[PDB]
């Protein structure tokens, strides 16, 4: 079926955490995912 693959995690640039893969911001540091690991061309 579908596969957005937005739930693909993102390693933070400050706290460096493995998050809930769907987080817009880190659970403790609160850095934006847009300011972290970029994904495949798909909004």
Residue least distant from Zn ion (Cβ)? 29
24-43 positions binding Zn ion, by CB under 5 A: 26, 29, 31
Length of the chain equals 43
Give the nearest distance from C-beta 26 to Zn ion in angstroms.
3
Can you tell me the distance from the alpha carbon of 2 to that of 30, in angstroms, rounded to the nearest whole number?
29
Q: What are phi and psi of 14, to 5 degrees?
A: -120, -70
- Is position 19 an interface residue for Zn ion (rule: CB under 5 A)? no
**Do residues 40 and 5 make contact, with C-beta atoms less than 8 angstroms apart?**
yes
Note whether 11 binds Zn ion by CB under 5 A: no
Residues that bind Zn ion (CB under 5 A): 12, 14-15, 26, 29, 31
């Amino acid at each position: 079926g579908h596969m957005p693959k937005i739930n693909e995690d993102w390693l933070c640039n400050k706290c460096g955490v493995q998050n809930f893969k769907r987080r817009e911001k880190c659970f403790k540091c609160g850095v934006p995912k847009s300011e972290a690991e970029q994904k495949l061309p798909l909004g």
